[PDB]
Amino acid sequence: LKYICAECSSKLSLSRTDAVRCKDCGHRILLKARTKRLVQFEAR
Amino acid sequence: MIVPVRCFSCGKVVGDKWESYLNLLQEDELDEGTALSRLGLKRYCCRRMILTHVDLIEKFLRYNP
Amino acid sequence: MNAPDRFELFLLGEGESKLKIDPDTKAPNAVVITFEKEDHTLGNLIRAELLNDRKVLFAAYKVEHPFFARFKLRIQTTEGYDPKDALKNACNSIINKLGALKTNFETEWNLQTL
Amino acid sequence: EEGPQVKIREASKDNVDFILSNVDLAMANSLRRVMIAEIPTLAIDSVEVETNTTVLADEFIAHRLGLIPLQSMDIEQLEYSRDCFCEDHCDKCSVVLTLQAFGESESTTNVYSKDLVIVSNLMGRNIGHPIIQDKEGNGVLICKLRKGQELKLTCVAKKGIAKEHAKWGPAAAIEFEYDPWNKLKHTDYWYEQDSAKEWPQSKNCEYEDPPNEGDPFDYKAQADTFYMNVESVGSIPVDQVVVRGIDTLQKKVASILLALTQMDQD
Ligand SMILES: [Zn+2]
Ligand SMILES: [Zn+2]
Ligand SMILES: [Zn+2]
């Protein structure tokens, strides 16, 4: 799948056997991107 | 966080009266009471709803992520 | 978590009838009617309108528990007067007064400004 | 007419100050209760979030979205989603309106209620349009975006009762006062010295006759004159608030009458 860095606006797609670090950054803090399958919210 | 859309107690819309309120404090240099009065907030529950509120979202927007 | 659905306050459940007419075993010519999915709004009004009828000996409503949207209404009328007819007369009276009130408010509103 | 009477003292777009005459207390109270809760209104009930990079949480936004006042004029020719024979929702029961916001300028990009755009087919019915009583014409401040923050979502608004959720509340605060002189003695006033000098005098006192000390207590008096002030939020005009309130009460009484008509079946 894909991931996004923390302290920079990027869009890595490195799956397993890759992990850290980031593309043109230097830090190893990687967050996971939002799901494509939408979720509904009862506006209450 | 951000200005509550409607007053808890009664139900009057107060979310559209935030910015205006601020103006009435800095542009016309009024006190909080008169500013709240001019916005049609006669009941002290809504008056509370605006006066008592703290806009924290401005400090939240200070982050880059 | 254990909180019930909100629509259970006005939507009738599976098999639950709107009204439950039960023969009161205490005093003769009396009846207890269970109103489902209704609160004080209807009960207080109907009860107050059942006291206007001078052929009604007793009329009282109660909500046995605020958790559940329902209330019981006990009615006792004079002999030769079925209580259901008292309820009907009360209801129709309410409807008429409300209609007249609506007409009056409309006519009064058509004469205003701003 | 012939029964209860109305006397409009003040009237505007947002408020109606009037006097209910020749009415029982329970009917005035019930009218108030119906005006508060049991009046159908269109409000956001479903929120589908695609992208949300704003500060606020998802359901945090969805909540205030639900509280947004929407046009509920022709709400009576709209239908409950629970009654319509459609899957989930459709155009005969719900109103779908989108929201697409994105930080553009270096300054904070505000997201108001005017940014809501109706998508579903209204087919003639005056409905769904978010009420904007704002002077600048912005409406309710929903959110705030930084520089590259985006908020993309869709809202399905359905017909609902304020009894189910306060977001479907057509009215705000309803002022209600009977017998400004305590001539019915429904209230034993609290005091330290003088009861009259301490407790403030109501405005409605201008519309009734003060008691005479030479006169005894009128024990055979009831409550006839009521002073009301109904305030609307915007979804439904004040006159239509009280009128649809009356019609709702009348209708739900007529349903009980109809039930009595139905229980005669073998
Ligand atoms: Zn990076
Ligand atoms: Zn309030
Ligand atoms: Zn439908």
Coordinates of C-alpha atoms and ligand atoms in Angstrom, one line a residue:
Chain A
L1 CA 0.0 0.0 0.0
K2 CA 1.0 3.6 0.5
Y3 CA 2.1 5.9 3.4
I4 CA 2.6 9.6 4.1
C5 CA 5.5 11.3 6.0
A6 CA 5.0 13.3 9.2
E7 CA 7.0 16.5 9.0
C8 CA 6.7 16.9 5.3
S9 CA 4.0 16.7 2.6
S10 CA 4.8 13.6 0.6
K11 CA 3.2 10.5 -0.7
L12 CA 5.3 7.3 -0.5
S13 CA 4.0 4.0 -1.8
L14 CA 6.7 1.8 -0.4
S15 CA 5.1 -1.5 0.7
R16 CA 6.8 -4.2 2.8
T17 CA 10.5 -4.9 2.8
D18 CA 11.1 -1.2 2.6
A19 CA 9.7 0.8 5.5
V20 CA 11.9 3.7 6.7
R21 CA 12.8 6.2 5.8
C22 CA 11.2 8.9 3.6
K23 CA 11.7 10.2 0.1
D24 CA 13.9 13.4 0.2
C25 CA 13.5 14.1 3.9
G26 CA 15.6 12.1 6.4
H27 CA 13.1 11.3 9.2
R28 CA 11.6 7.9 9.9
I29 CA 8.1 8.9 11.2
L30 CA 5.6 7.4 8.7
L31 CA 1.8 7.6 9.0
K32 CA -0.7 5.5 7.0
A33 CA -3.0 7.0 4.5
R34 CA -6.8 7.2 4.8
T35 CA -9.0 4.3 3.5
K36 CA -10.8 4.6 0.2
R37 CA -13.9 2.9 1.5
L38 CA -15.9 5.8 2.9
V39 CA -17.6 5.7 6.3
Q40 CA -21.0 7.4 7.1
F41 CA -21.7 9.6 10.0
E42 CA -25.1 10.0 11.6
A43 CA -25.1 13.8 11.9
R44 CA -26.3 13.8 15.6
Chain B
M1 CA -12.2 24.3 19.3
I2 CA -14.5 26.5 17.2
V3 CA -17.6 28.5 17.8
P4 CA -20.6 26.3 18.6
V5 CA -23.2 26.3 15.8
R6 CA -26.2 26.6 18.1
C7 CA -26.8 27.5 21.7
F8 CA -27.1 24.5 24.0
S9 CA -29.9 25.8 26.2
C10 CA -32.6 27.2 23.9
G11 CA -31.3 26.4 20.4
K12 CA -30.6 29.8 18.8
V13 CA -28.1 29.9 16.0
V14 CA -24.9 31.5 17.2
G15 CA -22.3 30.1 14.9
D16 CA -22.9 32.8 12.3
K17 CA -22.3 35.5 14.9
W18 CA -18.7 34.8 15.9
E19 CA -16.7 36.8 13.4
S20 CA -19.2 39.7 13.6
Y21 CA -18.8 39.7 17.4
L22 CA -15.0 40.0 17.0
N23 CA -15.5 42.9 14.7
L24 CA -17.8 44.6 17.2
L25 CA -14.9 44.3 19.7
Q26 CA -12.0 45.5 17.5
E27 CA -13.5 47.6 14.7
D28 CA -16.1 49.5 16.6
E29 CA -14.2 49.3 19.9
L30 CA -17.2 48.2 22.0
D31 CA -17.4 46.2 25.2
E32 CA -18.5 42.6 25.2
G33 CA -21.9 43.3 26.6
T34 CA -23.0 45.8 23.9
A35 CA -21.5 43.7 21.2
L36 CA -23.5 40.7 22.4
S37 CA -26.6 42.9 22.6
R38 CA -26.3 44.2 19.1
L39 CA -26.1 40.6 17.7
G40 CA -29.5 39.8 19.0
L41 CA -28.4 37.8 22.0
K42 CA -30.8 39.0 24.7
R43 CA -31.0 35.7 26.7
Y44 CA -28.0 35.2 28.8
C45 CA -27.7 31.5 27.7
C46 CA -26.7 32.4 24.1
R47 CA -24.9 35.5 25.5
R48 CA -23.0 33.0 27.5
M49 CA -22.6 30.7 24.5
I50 CA -20.6 33.4 22.7
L51 CA -19.0 35.3 25.6
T52 CA -17.8 32.1 27.3
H53 CA -16.4 30.5 24.2
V54 CA -12.7 30.2 23.4
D55 CA -11.6 29.8 19.8
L56 CA -8.9 27.2 20.0
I57 CA -8.9 26.2 16.3
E58 CA -6.7 29.2 15.5
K59 CA -4.0 27.7 17.6
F60 CA -4.7 24.3 16.0
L61 CA -4.1 25.7 12.5
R62 CA -0.6 26.7 13.5
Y63 CA 0.6 23.1 12.7
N64 CA 1.7 22.1 9.2
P65 CA 0.6 18.4 8.8
Chain C
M1 CA -24.5 1.4 24.9
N2 CA -27.7 0.5 26.6
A3 CA -29.5 3.6 25.5
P4 CA -32.7 3.0 23.5
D5 CA -33.5 4.3 20.1
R6 CA -34.9 7.8 19.9
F7 CA -37.7 7.0 17.4
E8 CA -39.0 4.7 20.1
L9 CA -40.6 7.8 21.6
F10 CA -43.0 8.3 18.7
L11 CA -42.7 5.2 16.5
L12 CA -44.9 2.2 17.5
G13 CA -43.0 -1.1 18.0
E14 CA -43.8 -4.5 16.8
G15 CA -47.4 -5.4 17.7
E16 CA -47.8 -2.4 20.0
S17 CA -51.3 -0.8 19.4
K18 CA -51.8 2.9 19.8
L19 CA -54.6 2.6 22.5
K20 CA -55.3 -0.1 25.0
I21 CA -58.8 0.0 26.5
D22 CA -59.0 -1.9 29.8
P23 CA -62.0 -2.5 32.0
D24 CA -61.2 -0.9 35.4
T25 CA -62.0 -3.5 38.1
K26 CA -62.0 -0.9 41.0
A27 CA -65.1 1.4 40.5
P28 CA -67.9 0.4 38.2
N29 CA -68.4 2.2 34.9
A30 CA -64.7 3.1 34.8
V31 CA -61.9 2.4 32.3
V32 CA -58.1 2.7 31.9
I33 CA -56.7 3.5 28.5
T34 CA -53.0 3.0 27.7
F35 CA -51.6 5.6 25.3
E36 CA -48.4 4.4 23.5
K37 CA -45.8 6.6 22.1
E38 CA -47.3 9.7 23.7
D39 CA -46.3 12.0 26.6
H40 CA -47.7 14.8 28.8
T41 CA -48.4 16.9 25.7
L42 CA -51.5 14.8 24.8
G43 CA -52.3 13.4 28.2
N44 CA -52.6 16.7 30.1
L45 CA -54.7 18.2 27.3
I46 CA -57.1 15.3 27.0
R47 CA -57.4 15.0 30.8
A48 CA -58.1 18.8 31.2
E49 CA -60.8 18.5 28.4
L50 CA -62.4 15.5 30.1
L51 CA -63.1 17.6 33.2
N52 CA -65.1 20.2 31.2
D53 CA -67.6 17.4 30.5
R54 CA -70.0 17.6 33.5
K55 CA -71.1 14.0 32.9
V56 CA -67.6 12.8 33.8
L57 CA -67.0 11.7 37.4
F58 CA -63.3 11.0 37.2
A59 CA -60.5 11.7 34.7
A60 CA -56.7 11.4 35.4
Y61 CA -53.6 10.6 33.4
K62 CA -50.1 9.5 34.5
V63 CA -46.7 8.6 33.1
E64 CA -45.6 5.5 35.1
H65 CA -41.9 6.0 34.0
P66 CA -40.1 8.7 32.0
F67 CA -37.9 6.1 30.3
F68 CA -40.8 4.9 28.3
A69 CA -43.0 7.1 26.1
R70 CA -46.5 6.1 27.3
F71 CA -49.2 7.1 29.7
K72 CA -52.3 5.7 31.3
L73 CA -55.6 7.6 31.3
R74 CA -58.4 6.6 33.7
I75 CA -61.9 7.8 33.0
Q76 CA -65.1 7.3 35.0
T77 CA -68.5 8.6 33.7
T78 CA -72.1 8.5 34.9
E79 CA -74.3 5.5 34.1
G80 CA -75.8 5.6 30.6
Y81 CA -72.7 7.3 29.3
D82 CA -69.9 5.2 27.7
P83 CA -66.5 6.7 28.6
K84 CA -65.2 6.2 25.0
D85 CA -67.8 8.7 23.9
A86 CA -66.5 11.2 26.5
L87 CA -63.0 10.7 25.1
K88 CA -64.4 11.3 21.6
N89 CA -66.2 14.4 22.6
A90 CA -63.1 15.7 24.4
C91 CA -61.0 15.0 21.3
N92 CA -63.4 16.6 18.9
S93 CA -63.7 19.6 21.2
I94 CA -59.9 20.0 21.2
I95 CA -59.7 19.7 17.4
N96 CA -62.4 22.4 17.0
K97 CA -60.8 24.8 19.4
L98 CA -57.4 24.3 17.7
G99 CA -58.9 24.9 14.3
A100 CA -60.7 28.0 15.4
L101 CA -57.4 29.1 17.1
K102 CA -55.5 28.5 13.8
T103 CA -58.1 30.5 11.8
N104 CA -58.0 33.4 14.3
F105 CA -54.2 33.5 14.3
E106 CA -54.1 33.5 10.5
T107 CA -56.7 36.4 10.3
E108 CA -54.7 38.3 13.0
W109 CA -51.4 37.6 11.2
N110 CA -52.7 39.0 7.9
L111 CA -53.1 42.4 9.5
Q112 CA -49.5 42.8 10.7
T113 CA -46.3 44.5 9.3
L114 CA -42.6 43.8 9.4
Chain D
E1 CA -64.3 33.7 15.3
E2 CA -66.1 32.0 18.1
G3 CA -63.6 30.3 20.4
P4 CA -60.0 31.1 21.5
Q5 CA -58.6 34.5 20.6
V6 CA -55.2 35.9 19.4
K7 CA -53.8 39.4 19.8
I8 CA -50.5 40.0 17.9
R9 CA -48.6 42.6 19.9
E10 CA -45.3 42.4 17.9
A11 CA -44.5 40.6 14.7
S12 CA -41.3 40.1 12.7
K13 CA -39.4 37.6 10.6
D14 CA -37.8 35.9 13.6
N15 CA -40.3 36.6 16.5
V16 CA -44.0 36.8 17.2
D17 CA -45.2 38.3 20.5
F18 CA -48.9 37.6 21.0
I19 CA -51.7 37.1 23.6
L20 CA -53.6 33.8 23.7
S21 CA -57.1 34.6 25.1
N22 CA -60.0 32.2 26.1
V23 CA -57.9 29.0 26.4
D24 CA -57.2 26.3 28.9
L25 CA -53.8 26.1 30.5
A26 CA -53.1 22.6 29.2
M27 CA -53.8 23.6 25.6
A28 CA -51.4 26.5 25.8
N29 CA -48.8 24.2 27.4
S30 CA -49.3 21.5 24.8
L31 CA -49.1 24.0 22.0
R32 CA -45.8 25.1 23.4
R33 CA -44.5 21.5 23.7
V34 CA -45.6 20.8 20.1
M35 CA -44.0 24.0 18.9
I36 CA -40.8 22.9 20.6
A37 CA -40.5 19.3 19.6
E38 CA -43.2 17.8 17.4
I39 CA -42.7 19.8 14.2
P40 CA -41.1 18.2 11.1
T41 CA -37.9 19.8 9.8
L42 CA -35.2 19.1 7.2
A43 CA -31.7 18.6 8.6
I44 CA -28.6 16.7 7.8
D45 CA -28.8 13.1 9.1
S46 CA -26.2 11.4 7.0
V47 CA -22.6 12.5 6.4
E48 CA -20.2 10.8 3.9
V49 CA -16.6 12.0 4.3
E50 CA -14.2 11.5 1.4
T51 CA -11.2 13.5 2.4
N52 CA -10.7 15.3 5.7
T53 CA -7.4 16.9 6.5
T54 CA -8.8 19.7 8.7
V55 CA -8.2 20.1 12.4
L56 CA -11.6 19.1 13.5
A57 CA -12.6 15.4 13.7
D58 CA -15.0 13.7 11.2
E59 CA -18.1 13.3 13.4
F60 CA -17.1 16.6 15.1
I61 CA -17.9 18.3 11.7
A62 CA -20.8 16.0 11.1
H63 CA -22.4 17.1 14.3
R64 CA -22.4 20.9 13.5
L65 CA -23.5 19.9 10.0
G66 CA -26.5 18.3 11.5
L67 CA -27.3 21.5 13.4
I68 CA -27.2 23.6 10.2
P69 CA -30.6 25.2 9.7
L70 CA -32.0 24.1 6.3
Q71 CA -35.1 25.3 4.4
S72 CA -38.1 23.4 5.6
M73 CA -41.0 25.3 3.9
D74 CA -42.3 22.5 1.6
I75 CA -41.2 19.9 4.1
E76 CA -44.8 18.7 4.3
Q77 CA -44.6 17.5 0.6
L78 CA -41.3 15.8 1.5
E79 CA -41.5 12.3 3.0
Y80 CA -39.8 10.3 5.8
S81 CA -37.0 8.0 4.6
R82 CA -38.5 5.3 6.9
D83 CA -41.8 5.6 5.0
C84 CA -40.6 5.8 1.4
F85 CA -40.4 2.6 -0.5
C86 CA -36.9 3.4 -1.7
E87 CA -33.5 1.8 -0.8
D88 CA -31.8 4.0 1.8
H89 CA -32.8 7.4 0.5
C90 CA -34.1 9.2 -2.7
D91 CA -35.4 12.5 -4.0
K92 CA -38.9 11.9 -2.6
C93 CA -37.6 11.6 0.9
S94 CA -34.1 13.2 1.3
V95 CA -32.1 16.1 0.0
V96 CA -28.5 15.6 -1.0
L97 CA -26.1 18.5 -0.8
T98 CA -22.3 18.4 -1.2
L99 CA -19.4 20.3 0.4
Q100 CA -16.0 20.8 -1.2
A101 CA -13.5 23.1 0.5
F102 CA -9.8 23.5 0.2
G103 CA -7.2 25.9 1.6
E104 CA -6.2 28.3 -1.2
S105 CA -4.7 31.5 0.2
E106 CA -1.9 31.8 2.8
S107 CA -4.5 33.2 5.2
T108 CA -7.1 31.0 6.9
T109 CA -9.8 29.8 4.6
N110 CA -13.1 29.7 6.4
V111 CA -15.8 27.2 5.5
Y112 CA -19.3 28.5 6.0
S113 CA -22.8 27.0 5.4
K114 CA -23.1 29.0 2.1
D115 CA -20.5 26.6 0.6
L116 CA -23.1 23.8 0.8
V117 CA -24.3 23.0 -2.7
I118 CA -27.6 21.2 -3.4
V119 CA -27.1 18.2 -5.7
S120 CA -30.3 16.2 -5.5
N121 CA -33.4 17.1 -7.5
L122 CA -35.7 19.4 -5.6
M123 CA -38.3 19.1 -8.3
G124 CA -40.1 22.3 -7.5
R125 CA -40.2 22.0 -3.7
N126 CA -38.7 24.9 -1.7
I127 CA -36.4 22.9 0.4
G128 CA -32.8 22.1 1.4
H129 CA -31.5 25.6 1.1
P130 CA -29.3 26.5 4.2
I131 CA -30.8 29.5 6.0
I132 CA -28.5 32.5 5.9
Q133 CA -29.5 35.3 8.3
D134 CA -25.9 36.5 8.3
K135 CA -25.3 40.1 7.3
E136 CA -22.4 39.5 5.0
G137 CA -24.3 36.5 3.7
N138 CA -21.9 33.7 4.9
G139 CA -24.1 31.8 7.3
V140 CA -22.9 29.3 10.0
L141 CA -19.1 29.1 10.3
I142 CA -18.6 25.3 9.9
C143 CA -14.8 25.0 9.7
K144 CA -11.4 26.6 9.1
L145 CA -8.7 25.4 6.7
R146 CA -5.0 26.3 6.8
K147 CA -2.9 26.3 3.6
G148 CA -3.2 22.9 2.1
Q149 CA -6.0 21.4 4.1
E150 CA -8.9 19.9 2.3
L151 CA -12.5 19.0 3.3
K152 CA -14.6 17.0 0.9
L153 CA -17.9 15.4 2.0
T154 CA -21.5 14.8 1.1
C155 CA -24.6 15.4 3.2
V156 CA -27.9 13.5 3.0
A157 CA -30.6 15.5 4.8
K158 CA -33.8 13.8 5.9
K159 CA -37.2 14.8 7.4
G160 CA -37.1 14.6 11.2
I161 CA -38.7 15.6 14.4
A162 CA -37.1 17.6 17.2
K163 CA -38.3 14.9 19.6
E164 CA -35.8 12.6 18.0
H165 CA -33.0 15.1 17.9
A166 CA -32.7 18.8 18.8
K167 CA -31.3 19.6 15.4
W168 CA -34.8 19.3 14.0
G169 CA -35.9 22.1 16.3
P170 CA -37.9 24.7 14.3
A171 CA -38.1 27.1 17.2
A172 CA -35.6 28.4 19.8
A173 CA -37.0 29.9 23.0
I174 CA -40.7 30.3 23.6
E175 CA -41.6 33.0 26.1
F176 CA -44.6 32.0 28.2
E177 CA -46.3 33.9 31.1
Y178 CA -49.8 33.9 32.6
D179 CA -51.2 36.1 35.3
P180 CA -48.5 38.7 35.8
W181 CA -50.0 39.8 39.2
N182 CA -50.2 36.4 40.8
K183 CA -54.0 36.8 41.3
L184 CA -54.4 33.1 40.9
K185 CA -51.8 32.6 43.6
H186 CA -50.1 29.8 41.7
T187 CA -46.8 31.0 43.2
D188 CA -45.8 31.8 46.8
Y189 CA -43.2 34.5 46.4
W190 CA -39.9 34.4 48.3
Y191 CA -38.7 37.5 50.1
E192 CA -36.6 38.9 52.9
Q193 CA -38.6 42.1 53.6
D194 CA -41.0 43.4 51.0
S195 CA -42.3 40.9 48.4
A196 CA -43.2 43.5 45.8
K197 CA -40.1 45.7 46.0
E198 CA -37.7 42.8 45.6
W199 CA -39.4 40.9 42.8
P200 CA -39.2 42.8 39.5
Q201 CA -42.4 43.8 37.6
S202 CA -43.3 42.0 34.4
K203 CA -44.0 43.9 31.1
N204 CA -47.3 42.0 30.7
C205 CA -48.5 43.8 33.9
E206 CA -49.3 46.7 31.5
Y207 CA -52.0 44.5 30.0
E208 CA -53.9 43.6 33.1
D209 CA -55.6 45.2 36.1
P210 CA -53.8 45.3 39.4
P211 CA -55.6 43.8 42.4
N212 CA -57.3 45.8 45.1
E213 CA -56.4 45.2 48.8
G214 CA -60.0 45.8 49.7
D215 CA -60.9 42.9 47.5
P216 CA -60.7 39.3 48.8
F217 CA -59.1 36.3 47.0
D218 CA -60.9 35.3 43.8
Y219 CA -61.0 31.5 44.3
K220 CA -63.3 30.8 41.3
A221 CA -60.9 32.2 38.8
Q222 CA -58.9 30.2 36.2
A223 CA -56.2 30.9 33.6
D224 CA -57.5 32.6 30.4
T225 CA -55.0 35.2 29.3
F226 CA -51.6 33.9 28.2
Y227 CA -48.6 36.0 27.0
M228 CA -46.4 34.2 24.5
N229 CA -43.4 35.1 22.3
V230 CA -42.4 32.5 19.7
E231 CA -38.9 32.7 18.1
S232 CA -38.0 30.9 14.9
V233 CA -34.5 29.7 13.8
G234 CA -35.1 30.2 10.1
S235 CA -36.1 26.8 8.8
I236 CA -39.8 27.7 9.3
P237 CA -41.3 31.1 9.6
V238 CA -42.8 32.0 13.0
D239 CA -46.4 32.2 11.8
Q240 CA -45.9 28.8 10.2
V241 CA -44.1 27.5 13.3
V242 CA -47.2 28.2 15.5
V243 CA -49.6 27.2 12.8
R244 CA -47.9 23.9 12.0
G245 CA -47.7 23.4 15.7
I246 CA -51.5 23.8 16.0
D247 CA -52.1 21.5 13.0
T248 CA -49.7 18.9 14.4
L249 CA -51.5 18.8 17.8
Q250 CA -54.8 18.7 16.0
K251 CA -53.6 15.9 13.7
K252 CA -52.2 13.8 16.5
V253 CA -55.5 14.2 18.4
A254 CA -57.3 13.1 15.2
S255 CA -55.1 10.0 15.1
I256 CA -56.3 9.1 18.6
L257 CA -59.9 9.7 17.4
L258 CA -59.2 7.6 14.4
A259 CA -57.8 4.9 16.6
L260 CA -61.0 4.9 18.6
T261 CA -62.8 4.6 15.3
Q262 CA -60.6 1.6 14.4
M263 CA -61.0 -0.3 17.7
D264 CA -64.7 -0.9 16.9
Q265 CA -63.6 -3.6 14.5
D266 CA -64.6 -7.2 15.4
Ligands
ZN1 ZN 9.7 13.2 4.6
ZN2 ZN -29.8 30.2 24.4
ZN3 ZN -37.1 7.8 -0.5

